[PDB]
Design a protein around this nucleic acid. Structure first.
Ligand SMILES: Nc1ccn([C@@H]2O[C@H](COP(=O)(O)O)[C@@H](O)[C@H]2O)c(=O)n1
Ligand SMILES: [Mg+2]
Ligand SMILES: [Mg+2]
Ligand SMILES: [Mg+2]
Ligand SMILES: [Mg+2]
Ligand SMILES: [Mg+2]
Ligand SMILES: [Mg+2]
Ligand SMILES: [Mg+2]
Ligand SMILES: [Mg+2]
Ligand SMILES: [Mg+2]
Ligand SMILES: [Mg+2]
Ligand SMILES: [Mg+2]
Ligand SMILES: [Mg+2]
Ligand SMILES: [Mg+2]
Ligand SMILES: [Mg+2]
Ligand SMILES: [Mg+2]
Ligand SMILES: [Mg+2]
Ligand SMILES: [Mg+2]
Ligand SMILES: [Mg+2]
Ligand SMILES: [Mg+2]
Ligand SMILES: [Mg+2]
Ligand SMILES: [Mg+2]
Ligand SMILES: [Mg+2]
Ligand SMILES: [Mg+2]
Ligand SMILES: [Mg+2]
Ligand SMILES: [Mg+2]
Ligand SMILES: [Mg+2]
Ligand SMILES: [Mg+2]
Ligand SMILES: [Mg+2]
Ligand SMILES: [Mg+2]
Ligand SMILES: [Mg+2]
Ligand SMILES: [Mg+2]
Ligand SMILES: [Mg+2]
Ligand SMILES: [Mg+2]
Ligand SMILES: [Mg+2]
Ligand SMILES: [Mg+2]
Ligand SMILES: [Mg+2]
Lengths: 243, 46, 95, 217
RNA sequence: CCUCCGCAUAAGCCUGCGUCAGAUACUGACAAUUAACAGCCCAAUAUCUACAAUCAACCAACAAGUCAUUAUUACCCUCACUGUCAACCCAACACAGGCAUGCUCAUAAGGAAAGGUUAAAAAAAGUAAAAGGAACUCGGCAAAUCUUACCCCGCCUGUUUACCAAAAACAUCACCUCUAGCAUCACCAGUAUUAGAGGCACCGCCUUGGCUCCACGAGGGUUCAGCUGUCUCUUACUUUUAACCAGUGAAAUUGACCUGCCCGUGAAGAGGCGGGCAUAACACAGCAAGACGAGAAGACCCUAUGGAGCUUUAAUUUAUUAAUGCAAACAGUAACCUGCAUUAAAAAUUUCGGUUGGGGCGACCUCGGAGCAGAACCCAACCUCCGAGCAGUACAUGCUAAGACUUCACCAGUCAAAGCGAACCUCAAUUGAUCCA
RNA sequence: GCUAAACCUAGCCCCAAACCCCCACCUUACUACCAAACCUUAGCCAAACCAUUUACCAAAAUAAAGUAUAGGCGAUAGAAAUUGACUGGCGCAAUAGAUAUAGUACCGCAAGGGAAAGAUGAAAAAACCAAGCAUAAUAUAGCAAGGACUAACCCCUAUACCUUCUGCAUAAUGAAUUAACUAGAAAUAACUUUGCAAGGAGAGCCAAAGCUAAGACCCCCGAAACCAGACGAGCUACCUAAGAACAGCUAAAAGAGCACACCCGUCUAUGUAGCAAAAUAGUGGGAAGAUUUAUAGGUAGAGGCGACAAACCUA
C-alpha cells in the first residue's frame, strides 16, 4: 500500500499532533524556519547570473554549500560556523590520477572571554573565525546576541544566548546593587535585543529539552474528585438558595 | 579424530554468549533482537 | 548507447557524433578527413587538398549516426546566414 | 578484554600481593608481547624504592636494621626486609648485607665525603668521586629507576657544581642533580648472569613460552 | 557364559520402559523427586598479616608458593526459597565413538557373543603343521622368537599438517649480533647480570668455523644370529561371513531394450552395421574378460582481455602513520594542535598482448620489390629471397575543379582535363588516426 | 482392481480511499526489595582489461530536452529559466496467490535459513483413465517397428532421440518414468492500414507530403568472486583465573628407567552409504611433566592465533 503522508512529512505530523503541538508558537516557528548558514568554507557567487566562458551567454549560477561536519567538542565550545571538511581530493591536482580521502580540520584555541551581560569569564575552544567575528561584532555579547542560530552553530552558544536574553528580559540585579547606574548602562548598551521572557525562556533549546520543559510545565498532580464534586454541590445548593 | 560433536553444552556459556542481556548490551545486538522481532520469531534470544 | 535513461526513460545522443559530424536534413552526414591538419610539411599538395575537403558519409555510416543521435538533430533548422542551407535538400535525385 | 590491571592496591603493604600473569596481552585482549605465558605462580613483594623516606612526623637521617635477605621471584636481585622506627619495608639488598646489619639513610650533604659502609645510602655530595653506586634516581625524590638489577654497579665519575656524572652499566653517562639519593655498593645475586638456564623446562617455568608469528605484519 | 565393569556426584537433558487403559519404550490418562545433602552468602570505617608445601620431624631445595584477623559503631527477628525422577548427555539414529571426579579391583554391581538350519566357494579372524628356514619381498611387512653391531641425520626430553606426511621439519638449552637510559592498562608494578628482535645449533680443544665427541630416536639404511606358513607349497579344523527357511527391509545405478560369437567396417577399440556361424524357454549359485561398467561437469594440459593470491628493482599514490621544513597559535629579550610541502615506512589499488602444427623456449608484429601466384585482378605460410622508417633539387613543393582508381570493408591512399595565378619535383617502401597539449 | 485421480474456497496480489498502533520482564529478560547517542558508504558493476570516470538510492508531473553542460571529450552523465498538474480488477485459485494453516515444525553455537499440507455433504443427531502393479511370466532373430499376411512370431526393409560438431549408431553430453511447473521483456527507423492534408497533432513537436494513431521486433539457468554490516573461540590455537589426576616395581628429586590409569596415534589388518562425514582390532609412543584435564573467561576475519604445518579459528 501507500502511506497517506510522505515520510519526509512524518516529522511535521508529529509536531502538529503531540505535546509538540502544545509547545508555544514562536518555538515551533524557529524549528520550522531552519534557514541557511553563512559561507565559511566556500566562496559565494556574488551574482545570480554570470556570462560563463566558452560561450558568451548568461547562465544562472547558484552557490551550493559544502557539507560541513561538526563534532560534539564544537558544540561544547564555539567555532563560528567552522567545522571539518570531509571530502575527497585528487592526487596531484589532476583528475587523471588517484582520488583519495581528506579531512580538513580547523585550528582550535582555548581563549578566555568576558561577557558584560552575565559578568563571567568563560574559557572556550574558539577559532580565528570566531575571534574575527567577535572583532567585527564589537564584543562577545554583541556577537552572541546578533548571530543567528545556525551561524552561531553551538548548543553552548545558544545557551549563552538565552542566558543573556533572559538577563536582559528580566533586567536582573546582575553584578550586585550599589552599581545600578552601571547596570543601567549595560542594559542600555544592549537594550536593542529585548524580547519577552516567555520567548527568551524558549530561545535556543533543543526539541528534546523543549518537550521536557513543556511536560514539566503541565505535570499538574490530579485534583481529587471530592474537591470537584463538593464544588459542584456547593454551586448547586447556592443556586437552589437563590431560587 | 571423529569430528561430529563440537556442541558441548553448558547453560552458563549459552546464556553468557547468546543471551538477552548480551544482545541488549551491544547496539548491534539490539538490532539483532529488533530483526528477530520484525521477522516474527517466537524466541528472540537465549 | 543509453536507449532508456535512468532519469527520464528517454534515449540519449552520442555527443562524440555531434562533435564530429553534420547532419543535413535529407539524411546526409558530412565529415572532415582524418588527418587533415597533421604533418602537412610531409604531405604533397594534392593529398593536402584531398584532406582539406568536407566529405559525405557512407550509407551504413549514415544509418549508424542516425541511430547514435536523437531526433533533435534531425529536425529542420532555419539559421540566419548558413553556409549549408543550400545543401540541406536534394535536387534532381532520381532514384 | 575486561582487563582491570591487577595492581589496584593503594597502601604500601609489606605482605606479598597475589600477582596476576598477563600472557603478554593488552587491555584489548590481544597479544602485544610475544613469548610470555604460564610460569610458576608468584606473589609480588611491594618494594619501597625511595631509600630516604622518613616515616610519619619524623626527621632527617635515620637508621634501619636488616631483618631478612630473601629471594624475590619478581626481579633478579635479592630483597632485604629492613626495619627502622615503627615501620618495616622491603628494599633491594646490595651484595654482602646479611641478616643483622645496620644501614643508614641520610639526606644530609656533608661537605666532606662521608666514610660510609657498603650498604647505606647518601646523596652524591656525601658520596666520594669515582664511587660504586646502584640505586640511582634521576630527579631527587622520584625514586631509583637505574642500576638496580642483580650485580650491576654504576660508577660516579665526577662531581660538578650542581650536578654529577654517572657511568650507567651500559658504558653510559648520565647527568644527575647533586641532591638526589643513591645507595653505594653493587647489588646482590652476583654470579647470576653465569647461571645456565639448562632446560627448556626451566625457561618455561620462568614464564617464557616459545612463540611464533612474532611479527603481526 | 561374559564385563575397565558398576554405583554415585558434577555437567547436560527435561518425565524419556511407574500404574492403568487403548490401539499397532506407540497413544492417552493417572501418579511422582518431600532436607538434614547442595545452592542462593558476608553492615561497615580505618587497619593487620617476612616466614611455603611436601607424614614436616632431621633434612633437601628452587621454579619461591592458596587457605589469617583486629578497636569501635549498628545488629536476638530466626530456618524461607530452589535442585532432588529415569534405561538419561554430545555425536541426524535405541550410534562399537566423545565424556570430568569419588569409590569397588573383579564385583555384593551389571550384563548375553548364537532368529533357525546347513557346513559349498570367495572373504574376515584364529589355531596347528612334515622337511627347510627369508629361498618371500621394495623392504622380515605380517607372524614367530628375541637379539647384535655398524653407518646417515637430528645433540637430548618435547612439537607438528584434527581427517593420507610425526620427519632430517618446528621448538629447545648454548652462543653471537641488532635496538632501548625509562615509571605507572602490555613489556612492568620491570631497569643493561634488564627488556625486545633475528640467527646458528649441545659439548672438549683451538679462531661460511673445523676436528673430535657421549647419550637419545615408532627417523633413514646395512650386517650377524635365531625364530617362524613370508616362502618352496600349501593344508586341516574352529568362528564370522556365507547358502537355505522365517520377520524386517535400503543405496549408488537406469534413453529404451525382444541385451550371442567370428571377421570386416565405421567419429579410426560394435550386442544392435555388412558377411558368416550359432540359437527352445525361464531360475539359483560363482566369476570378473567386456558393457571405452559406476562414482565425482578431469586436480594432469590448454583457453578466458574469469577469480584469488605471493614477491618485487611493474604502474599509480602517499589519503594514513613518521621525521624534517614552512607558516599558524604562546613566552620573550636590544612543548601541543592545525594548514601546506618532502623523504621514508607500512601499505592500498591494478595489470601481467598476440601468432604459435599442445603450451613453453626461441623468433617475429608496420610498409614495399621478386617467387610460390607463367597470360585481367586476387591468392596462405613459424614458405623461399631482397629492402625502408629517408635522401637530394629548388621551394608554383601555388589555388582550384570535370571525371576516375583504390590493396578485396571503413579509415586512409592515388591519378587528373579544364580554369586562375605562374617558371617558361627525383622518388621501391620511405610511415601513425582521435582526444589532448 | 489396487495404488490413485478429480474438486473450491482458505486465503492472497495490485490499486483507491483514509495518516496507524492483575502479575513478570535489561540480573542468566520474562526474576517482588539496595550506594552512555551524534564521524564521506564501499564494492560488485559499465568502460568489452583497468588505473579519472560509471545511471539511481539521499520527496519532486508534462514539456523545455536528452537541449545547454560535463567527460581516459569515451563509456557514459546531464540541467535550469519557462510551462497547461465515492473503491475497484480482460489478478491468483492450494507446486499458483503471500514464506505463511507459520516465521511455526525442522536445521544452525549463533546471526540466520526455513517447510509441507485441506477438499463427503442441504443435513454424517445419515462409481471409468498418469506412471507403478494385478487380473495374465516366458519360446530362436537382434532400436523392438514397418510392409504385410489366412495367421502374434516366422519373410523382407530397417545404425534411438537431443545437444555439441568438419563429421556421432557411436564406446561424446543429457535423459528410470509419470504428473505439474519451467525460458523473447523495448526503442531509432522502416513497412502495412486508417484520419486529415501544406499542414498534422486535444499546444511547447514535426513538416520542401507531411503529420497523427495503431499493428510488428529484442530469452532462461549456472561460477569462482568483490564489498558492507552482523554472528561465531561450547570445536580448535594461544592465554588468564581459581581446581584436580598421575598404580606398582626400580630408584632417590631428575624434562629419571619399565609400566597401569589417562594422553597420543608408529605399523598392520578390518572397514569404506562404515559402529564412525576417521572407527575397530592387535602393535606402539609419552605416562611427575615444555604433562594431561574439568569449569569460567579473553583474542574475530586480511583479523585472531601459531613450538611454521598455509596449521587452526563449529565436520
Ligand atoms: N604537447 C604536449 C606533448 C607532451 N606533453 C607531455 O609530455 C609527455 C610525453 O610522453 P613521454 O615522455 O613519452 C606526455 O605524456 C604529456 O604529459 C604535453 O603535456 N603536451
Ligand atoms: Mg554421525
Ligand atoms: Mg549380576
Ligand atoms: Mg543367522
Ligand atoms: Mg613347518
Ligand atoms: Mg625373488
Ligand atoms: Mg632376496
Ligand atoms: Mg613386525
Ligand atoms: Mg630429535
Ligand atoms: Mg595428517
Ligand atoms: Mg593432534
Ligand atoms: Mg600419521
Ligand atoms: Mg621423540
Ligand atoms: Mg530372506
Ligand atoms: Mg571391430
Ligand atoms: Mg552399444
Ligand atoms: Mg568410466
Ligand atoms: Mg570440465
Ligand atoms: Mg580474449
Ligand atoms: Mg576484477
Ligand atoms: Mg581478498
Ligand atoms: Mg597465446
Ligand atoms: Mg576501396
Ligand atoms: Mg569492466
Ligand atoms: Mg504456497
Ligand atoms: Mg511455500
Ligand atoms: Mg495403469
Ligand atoms: Mg570433435
Ligand atoms: Mg564435451
Ligand atoms: Mg545418465
Ligand atoms: Mg511433462
Ligand atoms: Mg575454551
Ligand atoms: Mg619421565
Ligand atoms: Mg612411517
Ligand atoms: Mg601449538
Ligand atoms: Mg614450511
Ligand atoms: Mg610450503
Amino acid at each position: 500500500p501507500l502511506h497517506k503522508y510522505p515520510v519526509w512529512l512524518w516529522k511535521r505530523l508529529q509536531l502538529r499532533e503531540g505535546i509538540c503541538s502544545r509547545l508555544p508558537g514562536h518555538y515551533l516557528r524557529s524549528l520550522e524556519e531552519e534557514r541557511t548558514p553563512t559561507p565559511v568554507h566556500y566562496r559565494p557567487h556574488g551574482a545570480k547570473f554570470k556570462i560563463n566562458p566558452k560561450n558568451g551567454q548568461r547562465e544562472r549560477v547558484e552557490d551550493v554549500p559544502i557539507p560541513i561536519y561538526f563534532p560534539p567538542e564544537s558544540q561544547r565550545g564555539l567555532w563560528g560556523g567552522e567545522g571539518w571538511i570531509l571530502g575527497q581530493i585528487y592526487a596531484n591536482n589532476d583528475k587523471l590520477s588517484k582520488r583519495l580521502k581528506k579531512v580538513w580540520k580547523p585550528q582550535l584555541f582555548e581563549r578566555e572571554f568576558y561577557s558584560e551581560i552575565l559578568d563571567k569569564k568563560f574559557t572556550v575552544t574558539v577559532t580565528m573565525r570566531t575571534l574575527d567575528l567577535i572583532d567585527e561584532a564589537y564584543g562577545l555579547d554583541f556577537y552572541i546576541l546578533k548571530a543567528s542560530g545556525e551561524d552561531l552553530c553551538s548548543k553552548f552558544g545558544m545557551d549563552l544566548k538565552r542566558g543573556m536574553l533572559l538577563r536582559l528580559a528580566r533586567q536582573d540585579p546582575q553584578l550586585h546593587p550599589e552599581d545600578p547606574e552601571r547596570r543601567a548602562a549595560i542594559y542600555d548598551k544592549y537594550k536593542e535585543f529585548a524580547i519577552p521572557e516567555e520567548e527568551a525562556e524558549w530561545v535556543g533549546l533543543t526539541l528534546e529539552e523543549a518537550i521536557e520543559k513543556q511536560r514539566l510545565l503541565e505535570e499538574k498532580d490530579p485534583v481529587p474528585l471530592f474537591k470537584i464534586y463538593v464544588a459542584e454541590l456547593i454551586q448547586q445548593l447556592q443556586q437552589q438558595a437563590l431560587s | 579424530k571423529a569430528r561430529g560433536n563440537e556442541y558441548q553444552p553448558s547453560n552458563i556459556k549459552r546464556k553468557n554468549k547468546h543471551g538477552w542481556v548480551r544482545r541488549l548490551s551491544t547496539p548491534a545486538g539490539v538490532q539483532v533482537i529488533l530483526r528477530r522481532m520484525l521477522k516474527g520469531r517466537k524466541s528472540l534470544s537465549h | 548507447l543509453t536507449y532508456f535513461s535512468a532519469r527520464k526513460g528517454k534515449r540519449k545522443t552520442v555527443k562524440a557524433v555531434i562533435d564530429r559530424f553534420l547532419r543535413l536534413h535529407c539524411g546526409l552526414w558530412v565529415r572532415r578527413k582524418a588527418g587533415y591538419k597533421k604533418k602537412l610539411w610531409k604531405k604533397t599538395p594534392a593529398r593536402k587538398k584531398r584532406l582539406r575537403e568536407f566529405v559525405f558519409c557512407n550509407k551504413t555510416q549514415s544509418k549508424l549516426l542516425d541511430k547514435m543521435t536523437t531526433s533533435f538533430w534531425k529536425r529542420r533548422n532555419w539559421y540566419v546566414d548558413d553556409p549549408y542551407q543550400k545543401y540541406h535538400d536534394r535536387t534532381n535525385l532520381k532514384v | 578484554a575486561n582487563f582491570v590491571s591487577w595492581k589496584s592496591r593503594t597502601k604500601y603493604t609489606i605482605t606479598p600481593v597475589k600477582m596476576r600473569k598477563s600472557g603478554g596481552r593488552d587491555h584489548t585482549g590481544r597479544i602485544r608481547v610475544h613469548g610470555i605465558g604460564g610460569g610458576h605462580k608468584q606473589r609480588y613483594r611491594m618494594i619501597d624504592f625511595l631509600r630516604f623516606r622518613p616515616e610519619e612526623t619524623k626527621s632527617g637521617p635515620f637508621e634501619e636494621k636488616v631483618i631478612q635477605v630473601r629471594y624475590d621471584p619478581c626481579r633478579s636481585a635479592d630483597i632485604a626486609l629492613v626495619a627502622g622506627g615503627s615501620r618495616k619495608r622491603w628494599i633491594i639488598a646490595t651484595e654482602n648485607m646479611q641478616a643483622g646489619d645496620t644501614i643508614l639513610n641520610s639526606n644530609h650533604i656533608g661537605r666532606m665525603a662521608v666514610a660510609a659502609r657498603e650498604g647505606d645510602a647518601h646523596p652524591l655530595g656525601a658520596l666520594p668521586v669515582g664511587t660504586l653506586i646502584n640505586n640511582v634516581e634521576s630527579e631527587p625524590g622520584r625514586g631509583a629507576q637505574y642500576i638496580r638489577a642483580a650485580g650491576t654497579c654504576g660508577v660516579l665519575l665526577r662531581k660538578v657544581n650542581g650536578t654529577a656524572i654517572i657511568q650507567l652499566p651500559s658504558k653510559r653517562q648520565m647527568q644527575v642533580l647533586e641532591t638526589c639519593v643513591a645507595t653505594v655498593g653493587r647489588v646482590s645475586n652476583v654470579d647470576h648472569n653465569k647461571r645456565v638456564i639448562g632446560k627448556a623446562g626451566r625457561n618455561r617455568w620462568l614464564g617464557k613460552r616459545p612463540n611464533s608469528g612474532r611479527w603481526h605484519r
